[PDB]
Each structure stands twice: as C-alpha cells, then as structure tokens.
Design a protein around this nucleic acid. Structure first.
Ligand SMILES: [Mg+2]
Ligand SMILES: [Mg+2]
Ligand SMILES: [Mg+2]
Ligand SMILES: [Mg+2]
Ligand SMILES: [Mg+2]
Ligand SMILES: [Mg+2]
Ligand SMILES: [Mg+2]
Ligand SMILES: [Mg+2]
Ligand SMILES: [Mg+2]
Ligand SMILES: [Mg+2]
Ligand SMILES: [Mg+2]
Ligand SMILES: [Mg+2]
Ligand SMILES: [Mg+2]
Ligand SMILES: [Mg+2]
Ligand SMILES: [Mg+2]
Ligand SMILES: [Mg+2]
Ligand SMILES: [Mg+2]
Ligand SMILES: [Mg+2]
Ligand SMILES: [Mg+2]
Ligand SMILES: [Mg+2]
Ligand SMILES: [Mg+2]
Ligand SMILES: [Mg+2]
Ligand SMILES: [Mg+2]
Ligand SMILES: [Mg+2]
Ligand SMILES: [Mg+2]
Ligand SMILES: [Mg+2]
Ligand SMILES: [Mg+2]
Ligand SMILES: [Mg+2]
Ligand SMILES: [Mg+2]
Ligand SMILES: [Mg+2]
Ligand SMILES: [Mg+2]
Ligand SMILES: [Mg+2]
Ligand SMILES: [Mg+2]
Ligand SMILES: [Mg+2]
Ligand SMILES: [Mg+2]
Ligand SMILES: [Mg+2]
Ligand SMILES: [Mg+2]
Ligand SMILES: [Mg+2]
Ligand SMILES: [Mg+2]
Ligand SMILES: [Mg+2]
Ligand SMILES: [Mg+2]
Ligand SMILES: [Mg+2]
Ligand SMILES: [Mg+2]
Ligand SMILES: [Mg+2]
Ligand SMILES: [Mg+2]
Ligand SMILES: [Mg+2]
Lengths: 147, 51, 51, 134, 51, 124
RNA sequence: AGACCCACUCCCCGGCGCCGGGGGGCCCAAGUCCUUCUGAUCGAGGCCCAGCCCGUGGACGGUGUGAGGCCGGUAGCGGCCCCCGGCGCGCCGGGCCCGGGUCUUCCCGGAGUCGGGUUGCUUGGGAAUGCAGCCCAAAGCGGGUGGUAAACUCCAUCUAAGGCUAAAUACCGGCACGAGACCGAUAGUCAACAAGUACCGUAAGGGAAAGUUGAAAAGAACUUUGAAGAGAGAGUUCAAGAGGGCGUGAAACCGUUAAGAGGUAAACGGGUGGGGUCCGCGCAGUCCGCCCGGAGGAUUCAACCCGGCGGCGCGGUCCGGCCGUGCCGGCGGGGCGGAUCUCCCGCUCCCGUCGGCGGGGGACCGCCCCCCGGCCGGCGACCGGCCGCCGCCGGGCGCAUUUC
RNA sequence: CGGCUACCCACCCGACCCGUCUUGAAACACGGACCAAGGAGUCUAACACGUGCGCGAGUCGGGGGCUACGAAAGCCGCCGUGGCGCAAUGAAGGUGAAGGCCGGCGCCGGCCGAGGUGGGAUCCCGAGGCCUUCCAGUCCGCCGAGGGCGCACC
RNA sequence: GACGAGUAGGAGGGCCGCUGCGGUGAGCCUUGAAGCCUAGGGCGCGGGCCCGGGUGGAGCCGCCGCAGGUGCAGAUCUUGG
C-alpha cells in the first residue's frame, strides 16, 4: 500500500530522493537496452555473456510433441506404485516381481541415478539409459520396451 | 485512475480454510467473544447449540 | 462440522483432501509450563539485587 | 431490506423521483392517515387528501383538537390549506399557512362514487391479506 | 490440547435438553489472528467495484 | 489457555482504550482497570472482582468458579458484603489469602474495595 | 437405374376454434401511546407478569432534526383488472403417397483457374507465408499440402478456383435499468443552473464564469428626513448577528475605538525589566493511616447453632462418568482407499463347448466410525455425588472493659 | 500573591532574504507584491533481492463447472489439462548423473555398501571435586583435565 | 557504561496530519456537531493535540486493521481576490 511506501517520507526533501547535482531526468541512458554494444558494453559483458550473435542450426517448424519425453529416476521409481506393492513383493516367497508401467504414470524415459533397493522388478518403459538398465540387471530385474 | 487497477486479490485455499478454522476455534473461547464485545454474560454456554 | 473440516485423526469426508492444521505447540499454558519441577530444578539462582 | 433488483435504493434517484413526480403521483404521495373512527369503520389506514375533507392538525404550531375543512390542495408545494389555519401578513390580509398531509388526520371523508370504490378495494385487499395470513 | 468436551443442546424454551454431542476438533484448531487478518484483508478486496 | 488468549486480547479487545499516552481495559473484572496480563479478568481460569453493590451501600465481590469455564452464565458467583470498612477488608483479605484464589491481586482488590467504600459515603 | 428381399404410412403447414410467460394499471401490517426539551419534533424516559404493536415488511425517500410503526414504498410462491405470447387439444382445406438391406450396370465435377517467372506490399514464415500487377499459362490413376531450393522414388492427407447456416464472441453510439472502499461546485463530463448557452473568429472551429434566504415569504404594514439611492423607528421570524446573488463567513486588504512605542528601514534569536489581558471562584492554607485521652450514639465483637455458596490432593489408594493428537486384546457391526489377489453377467472371433475384453461379486491390506473388556495420562482448553479442611453470606444465641 | 509560556514596549549581545544551480551566493545571478484554493515518483506488466504466511517434491484453480450485502463465499479431483520445480549437457544426430572386496571359468555367484581431510556452534563419556563435628558411604544434581560423533557452512 | 555534527543519499519510530472502508467505544450530539475567531489554560523537543470564551444549526470523533487522487513557499506555477 502507498501508506508504507518511501514516498510518504520523502515529503519536505527537495529532490525527492533523486539527487541535486544530476537531476532525475527522463532517460539519461537511452530507452530499454539501448547502446548494449556502445556504452553498456561493460554491463552486457560482465553480466550477459553470449548475448550477441547467432549459434547453431535453425529449426523452422518446431513442435514440442515430437521431442516430448519426460524422465524419471530409479530413486523415485518405487514412488510411482503404492507402498503395499513393495511390501507384498518383499514379503513374497514365490519370487514373483511387480511390474512397473512408468508410461501409465506419465514418464517415457527411465534414468538410473539413485540407489535401487534389493528387490526384483519389471520396468516397462519406452527408453532406458545404459546405467539404468545395468542397475536393474545388477539388482535383479527385467526391462520391457513399449511403443 | 484506470479501470484495470488490480482490484482483486486471490488467496490460497489451504490458508482460506486455515482462517475459518481458526475463526471457529476462537468462537468457543469466552475471552475472545467478550473481547469482540458481544453481550454474552448470561448465555448458558458459548458453544450455543440449539435443537 | 467434523465431516466438513475433519478430525485430527480423521480427514475431511466432504473435501477432496484436507485435515486440521497441526499445532506448532500443544501445551499453550506458559505459566503452568514454567511453574513445574522439571524446569525449575534445572535453573540458576536469580539475581534480583539492583546495583 | 429490499430484494427486487428493479426498485432503486439510491438516495439521489429517490429524491429526484419524488421532487419531479407528476401530479397524478403527487396525489397518491400526499395522503393523510384516517382517524381512529374512520380506520375502524372503513378498514383503511390512509387515503389521499382531497379538496373538501374535514381534517385536524397533529404536529406543528397550529396543532390541536379544532376541526377544519380543506380549501385547496397545492400539490406543487406538497401543501394543503385549511379553513382556519392561517396567519396575517404585514398589511393585515390573512393568508393560509401550508401544512403537509403527513401531519394531517382526516376526520370526515367527502365520499363520492369513486371515493367509495377506492375504499372498498382497499378494504377488500387488506381483508384477503389478513385471511391469507392465517 | 487433546481433550474433547461434551457440549449439550438447549431446547427452544432455554433449559438444557438431554442431547449432548462432543465438541468437534475444529474448535481446538490453532488460533492465528495474523492469518485471519491477512485472509480478511485480501478477501475483502474481491467484492470491490472499480472506480 | 491464558497466554494464547492474551496474545490476541492485548491489542484487539473492545475493552481496550488508548489515549493521552495511556491505555486501560474496561472489562468487568479488571482490578486497577488497566490493561495487563496480571489484572485481566477474562483470560484467567480463576478471577476476582470488586464492584459497588446495587444499592448505594456495600460491595459485591465476584468470583469465578472452576467447573463452568465455558459456561459464562454460571461461571461467576456474586457475594454482597454490607458491613463496616474494617470487617469488609478482613473478609476480602481472608477470602483471597486463605483460599489461595489468585493471591497475586489481593492487595489490589483491597485497594479497590476501600476506594468504593470511601466513595459510597456522603461527600462533604 | 434395374432385379430380389424386408418395410412404414402420420409428415407438414395454414384458416377457424376450446385449455391450464411477459407488458402495464389499482391495492394490501404495525404508536403520531403517556410525560418531557424545542420554533417544529423524527430528540430523551416509560409502555407489566402479551419485557408498547408489526415483522416473509428494521432498504430508501419525504414529512418544520437524526422515524421500522405519519405518508409512498419496502417483504411476500400477496390480491384484483386489461393486452399479448411460446405450449396441449379439436375440426377444416389442400400438399406427398414417400422407406431400409443385398446383387447387377452406368456416372462422377467448378480454367485466364491453379501453377511457373518477375515486380511491389504484408507476414514470424526464413531459395520468396499471404495478397496484387504484367508475361507464360495447363493435367486428369490429376491437382494441392507434407515450414531449405532441385531431381528420382515409395507414402500420408484433402479435393481449390460456386453458395447458405443460429450457438458460444465484441459494444466508450441508442432505449430502460441497478450498483460503487470514486468525485463533492477551482473536484467530478466542457456543462449539477435558460451549456456546447453566452461570447470571439469570414470560415474551418474555439468556448466559459455561474448552487445554497427562510420550516413556512411570514419578502419588512405603518411613522419620520430626503427627489431618490438610502437611513432612523416599528414589525415578521427562535434568528435579520438570515433582508431578494440573502447557510457558514478565514486570509491578504481598509476604517474606527482602546493600549504602547517611534531620528540608525522593517523584522528576528538569547536574556531580563515594565505595562495590560484574563486564569488560579486563591488571600489564614493539604491531609491520610496507627496509637493515647475526653465527650457521646448503636441492637454490636469474639466464640457457638442452622441453611446456602465457593476453594482446597481432602481421600498417599472414596465412588461414578468423559476424553487422548495413548496403547492392547475382537468366535464384534460398518464406511473410505488400494498399481494385493481371485464366482456371476454383458461384448467379439470358432463348432451348449475350448481358448479373449468390460462390468459386478468375494477374499486381503491400510485408515477411520461405533460396541465390549484391560492398562497409562488428563479433567489447569475437558467433572459429577459423599467425606475432610478452610473461607464467605444470611438468619439466631450472643449484651456491652468486646465491636462499629 | 503566583502565571516561564501567549499581547505590547525598553535595554545588552548576536543577527545580510528565502529557494535553486554552483568549487565558491546576502550577492551588481535567476524565480518571488500579498492572500485563499489546486499542484507534482501514481497505476499496469516483467525481473531480481530481502521479509511475512500456507503447503511442501510437490505447489497453484488464475480458465470453466456445481450451489440486499452476494459481481461475494463454498465446492470440483476421473475438471491439475497447464505453468513452475523435480536433470543437465550438445549446434544437432543424441546422451543423460559412486564403487570396492571374495571364489570359479573379460564373464558369472556372494559380501560391504553411497566419499576423504582441516576448521567447525552445539551434543556424549568422565582423572576428580562442590564442606557443618569426623570417618566409610549411596542417590539426585553441578563444574571440570582430557577424549569422541561431529549441524550448517568455508 | 560509551556516544550524540551533517549536504546529496539510505534506514527506522511516529499515541504526527487528511479522506473513505471493515470492526469496535450500550461513543458524542438541537440542554448544540463540523467550520471559524480568540490578549484564555495547557501538553508534547517536534509533526501537532486537548480543554475555556463568541458565531453555527446537523452532523462528528477515539482505538484495531485496510485503501489512497493523503501534507506546499516558491516552479517568469493554474484560478480567484
Ligand atoms: Mg536531504
Ligand atoms: Mg533513490
Ligand atoms: Mg537543483
Ligand atoms: Mg545522473
Ligand atoms: Mg526515471
Ligand atoms: Mg563507438
Ligand atoms: Mg415489492
Ligand atoms: Mg428524515
Ligand atoms: Mg422512542
Ligand atoms: Mg424512514
Ligand atoms: Mg420507532
Ligand atoms: Mg405504512
Ligand atoms: Mg503499403
Ligand atoms: Mg518424396
Ligand atoms: Mg469446393
Ligand atoms: Mg467451397
Ligand atoms: Mg456466409
Ligand atoms: Mg451489488
Ligand atoms: Mg461554482
Ligand atoms: Mg465552496
Ligand atoms: Mg466544473
Ligand atoms: Mg464560484
Ligand atoms: Mg452564497
Ligand atoms: Mg458557498
Ligand atoms: Mg443564529
Ligand atoms: Mg443562519
Ligand atoms: Mg439550514
Ligand atoms: Mg454570507
Ligand atoms: Mg493611539
Ligand atoms: Mg550587536
Ligand atoms: Mg537555480
Ligand atoms: Mg546544470
Ligand atoms: Mg562559475
Ligand atoms: Mg542562495
Ligand atoms: Mg558584485
Ligand atoms: Mg541580470
Ligand atoms: Mg536560470
Ligand atoms: Mg522578480
Ligand atoms: Mg492547499
Ligand atoms: Mg524471499
Ligand atoms: Mg515457461
Ligand atoms: Mg547527529
Ligand atoms: Mg479518496
Ligand atoms: Mg490574531
Ligand atoms: Mg435545516
Ligand atoms: Mg501557496
């Protein structure tokens, strides 16, 4: 609110908090990003490196659906399915392993980052990382690819 | 003054329910109701439930 | 009211997912807390001699 | 409180509609309450003032129990003039003093063919209202 | 706290009736005047016509 | 509780009144009639009160019981004392000290009772 | 279109005529009750043991203040009257005697148009997104599109150059409305008033200032000097200290009266002195407790009896209830959720059956509600009945070396 | 009789007219006869930082829908579509975040398992001691040589 | 216990001031509100505020929060005198 702003305590001071030698003029340094190459060179090089110039190829008609591929990690892999699935699989004596369809959850690619608990799984995903697959194989499990 | 001043403010629903829950809880404390100023001295009990 | 805002151990039956906000402190009686043997025993001697 | 969205509650609009009301609305606005005998007889609480009604004065400097007949109804000033409610001017000529119908109680109605049917309609409406109540 | 009292129900005549229901846990929710004031301040602006 | 209610009442109650660099509390059971956590008459489980009687003589002492904390109608018991000043002071002093009923403000109650007693007598 | 099978008649108007959603009109509750101010009350007190009356009506406005009940209205799935409307029936005239599946045979498309070259504008469209001018200017298993120009080669998707169509959508013009954390006559539209008026410019155009008598004009009869403006009386009003641009009436400015001062322009800060204005209702000067002494007056103290109230861990461990944001047991009766498993029904392929999907049901687990039993804690956010102690109040006995 | 203060006068000392620009203003620098009213860092959007509140690897109904003040308020959850965050890097094709030990023939089975050092607020242990006559003596605490597991953070 | 200067500039406290809104004072008020004047009594360092006297006739304020078209000595400032 304007009650608590600084302008309420600036009344009585001639310059209104803007200086007496250099008055608060309209646009002493140009409009917007003016003179980035000329008189704002130091600021645009000390704080915006790479700002000037092009790089890379140009993709004219880019559609995000083609490149849409959310990823999940093995630490969160068990979080997708309910707790009772994991506890029953751990208690299970016949060696049956739960099947985790990460696609139904909404992740296409599985990346292996965290520690995977010692428990057989069947991860049914769309893509797999090399380390993710070898962790699943090492802990004991299967990887199923779906389209 | 322009018509498109930000008249309306939105609040999170969790704290919306927080406030009314606190209001109801405070409504059962005789000190906080007399502090509000309602004449409640001879009321049989503050959580006034009727048939 | 209990079905609206839920109990401490029972969530609200009419809201999608809501429960009463937990207290930051339970025993709010500060005087009773201070005037207990457990705290008073582990205290230093007072110094009320104004110099 | 009022719930009809087509009826104003604004002070300015109500004042404008009152001070610019046409004469046929001025007649209904300038209505005086009936006496206790009249209301217990015709079952009507109030009626618009007319030219030839015997009325009293309830509030003001000229209030009392004396009974006087109206002489004219100056609806432009929201004022009626009575038979003997008057004061002298500087030159000595007597001119009547305007009295609002709100502070006037009708003692005897100058009932006519139209006046009787108005009273019967008002009595009928309030009787069916009371019957609907219970 | 943790207790849950038993609030009686009064009839129309004034005297207490035999019906007696427990106090809902909402009435023991934390009292936060800061949150109530914040919510009231922000929500009272939503029924404001522009000028 | 008590501190929980005080943190709300300390600056929001209708009895609160601030002017001329001073603040007071007009709650019905406030000895010394000043806003403080010690003398508040609504946020404490046990409370005393000294008021003039209905007649121009005597003093009515109001005490808050233990059971009906949430029942304001029966929460207070009013006892009327109509006797000499010394006896009235002794009665109130015994009532607070020997019952251990909020002994923090027994002297304030005695001061208020004495002030009411001297005010009730005819003024020269 | 032909053949073979199945297959329906009630579709549609419009003329006439009988039935149960709007546009306006007229209306509907309750104090002018008793005292009391006032100039007037709508101000203030009371209206019982019907805590004045009504209230589905305590919005608003007016009425000589500030009114739920004086009036209009207000609430109402409240009432009456007139006009018209979308429905649900009847006849009447005609209009059409119309449909689906299988098989056989034929047909099927919009040209100065697309497209290509160039130029110009536009777009984010970048070897040219869209549009237009000029030139060339077609094809039909063809043409267009498939965001990098081109050639070849398989694909995917539509059918351009003909047309119609409510709905959701925009509204600072217009009609009638409602509202506002807005403005309150130098503000707010330029304009609250005879305002786009007066007024200026040849013209296009420019464009103001300007609200408040009083409740009611009751607008000052009449006398007196003067020609009159205008005074002096008188009178109206509570009030002319409201007298026709008249509510309130500041400052700059001016006159008069009173006080003081005055040849270094006036004026200013510190320090005093003098004079005025009023203030201290001052001018024999505060009392407040305890004790001593003297004059007094009480229905009088302490201690006991009865009744009531309250507090207290009383009772180390009285009895009974309630809760746990504590737990345990359950040959208990349930709701929620589960990505924990597993008899019935519906659907599709095959000859009532073997092999599939969806739904329902059952079991299992987690949480929660209720009932029973057993412990822990609390009742100081949440107590009841006895007993014990203490305090207080009332009524007695108390009788003056006590008490006031 | 008292009243510093607010009215006037007299005297002693001090005392250049304000604002603004300027290194330098009382300036022969500019604005200023006096008075009244109006009058100038507001609003929208974006970002960053810090602080308050709710929830928390989740969070948000802002759009839509269901039910005088109220054009409010409540609810949706199989309306979380979507934004932000939970993963970065490369122009792109893409890739995408500990390992060690043991036995057999680079591969198989089992075990340990998600860094180290220096400084690190706090916490844990305790060589003894904190006296009422003196000795042995226990329990509840308190201080403490020294030794540790070390928050955050560098 | 120590310290106290200050332009531009920054921050904090305002029981300093104005207008309106939500609550609150069984608030004030025709037995006289706002406004205005006052050689009156004062308080607060100060922003300013409370009482006394005169006109006024109809509205007004304190506290807790919210919001701003919120404070003038100037700008050859605008309007009016
Ligand atoms: Mg400054
Ligand atoms: Mg600045
Ligand atoms: Mg400057
Ligand atoms: Mg500069
Ligand atoms: Mg700027
Ligand atoms: Mg250069
Ligand atoms: Mg109506
Ligand atoms: Mg009125
Ligand atoms: Mg009354
Ligand atoms: Mg009214
Ligand atoms: Mg009334
Ligand atoms: Mg009426
Ligand atoms: Mg062009
Ligand atoms: Mg191709
Ligand atoms: Mg076509
Ligand atoms: Mg077409
Ligand atoms: Mg068309
Ligand atoms: Mg509205
Ligand atoms: Mg004007
Ligand atoms: Mg004005
Ligand atoms: Mg104007
Ligand atoms: Mg004017
Ligand atoms: Mg005027
Ligand atoms: Mg005026
Ligand atoms: Mg007057
Ligand atoms: Mg006047
Ligand atoms: Mg007036
Ligand atoms: Mg005037
Ligand atoms: Mg003179
Ligand atoms: Mg000198
Ligand atoms: Mg300058
Ligand atoms: Mg310069
Ligand atoms: Mg120079
Ligand atoms: Mg200067
Ligand atoms: Mg010079
Ligand atoms: Mg010059
Ligand atoms: Mg200059
Ligand atoms: Mg000049
Ligand atoms: Mg001004
Ligand atoms: Mg932050
Ligand atoms: Mg984004
Ligand atoms: Mg300093
Ligand atoms: Mg404003
Ligand atoms: Mg003066
Ligand atoms: Mg008036
Ligand atoms: Mg000025």
């Amino acid at each position: 609110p304007s009650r608590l702003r600084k302008t309420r305590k600036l009344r009585g001071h001639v310059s209104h908090g803007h200086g007496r030698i250099g008055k608060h003029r309209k646009h002493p340094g140009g409009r917007g990003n003016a003179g980035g190459m000329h008189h704002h060179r130091i600021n645009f090089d000390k704080y915006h490196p790479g700002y000037f110039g092009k790089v890379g190829m140009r993709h004219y008609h880019l559609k995000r659906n083609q490149s849409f591929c959310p990823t999940v990690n093995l630490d969160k892999l068990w979080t997708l399915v309910s707790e009772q699935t994991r506890v029953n699989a751990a208690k299970n004596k016949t060696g049956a392993a739960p099947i985790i369809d990460v696609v139904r959850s909404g992740y296409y690619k599985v990346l292996g980052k965290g520690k995977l608990p010692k428990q057989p799984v069947i991860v049914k995903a769309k893509f797999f990382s090399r380390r993710a697959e070898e962790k699943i194989k090492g802990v004991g499990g299967a990887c199923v690819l779906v389209a | 003054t322009k018509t498109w001043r930000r008249w309306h403010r939105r609040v999170n629903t969790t704290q919306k329910r927080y406030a009314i829950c606190s209001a109801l809880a405070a409504s059962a404390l005789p000190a906080l109701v007399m502090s509000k100023g309602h004449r409640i001295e001879e009321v049989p009990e503050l959580p006034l439930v009727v048939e | 009211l209990d079905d609206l805002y839920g109990t401490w151990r029972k969530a609200a039956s009419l809201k999608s997912n809501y429960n009463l906000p937990m207290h930051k402190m339970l025993n709010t009686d500060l005087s009773r807390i201070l005037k207990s043997p457990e705290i008073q025993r582990a205290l230093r001697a007072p110094r009320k001699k104004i110099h | 409180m009022k719930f009809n969205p087509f009826v104003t509650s604004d002070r300015s609009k109500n004042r404008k509609r009152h001070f610019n009301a046409p004469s046929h609305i001025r007649r209904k606005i300038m209505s005086s309450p009936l006496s206790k005998e009249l209301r217990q007889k015709y079952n009507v609480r109030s009626m618009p003032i007319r030219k030839d009604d015997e009325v009293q004065v309830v509030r003001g400097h000229y209030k009392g129990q004396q009974i006087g007949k109206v002489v004219q109804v100056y609806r432009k000033k929201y004022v009626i003039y009575i038979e003997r409610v008057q004061r002298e001017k500087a030159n000595g000529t007597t001119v009547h003093v305007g009295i609002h119908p709100s502070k006037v109680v009708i003692t005897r109605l100058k009932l006519d063919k139209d006046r009787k049917k108005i009273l019967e309609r008002k009595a009928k409406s309030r009787q069916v209202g009371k019957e609907k109540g219970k | 706290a943790c207790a849950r009292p038993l609030i009686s129900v009064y009839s129309e005549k004034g005297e207490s009736s035999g019906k007696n229901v427990t106090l809902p846990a909402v009435f023991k929710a934390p009292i936060r005047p800061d949150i109530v004031n914040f919510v009231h301040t922000n929500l009272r602006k939503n029924n404001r016509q522009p000028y | 509780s008590a501190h929980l209610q005080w943190m709300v009442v300390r600056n929001c109650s209708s009895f609160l009144i601030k002017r001329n660099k001073q603040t007071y509390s007009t709650e019905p059971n406030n000895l010394k009639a000043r806003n403080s956590f010690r003398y508040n008459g609504l946020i404490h489980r046990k409370t005393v009160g000294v008021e003039p009687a209905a007649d121009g003589k005597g003093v009515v002492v109001v005490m808050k019981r233990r059971s009906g904390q949430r029942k304001p109608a029966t929460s207070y018991v009013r006892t009327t004392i109509n006797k000499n000043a010394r006896a009235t002071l002794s009665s109130i002093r015994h009532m607070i000290r020997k019952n251990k009923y909020h002994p923090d403000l027994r002297m304030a109650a005695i001061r208020r009772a004495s002030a009411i007693l001297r005010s009730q007598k005819p003024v020269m």
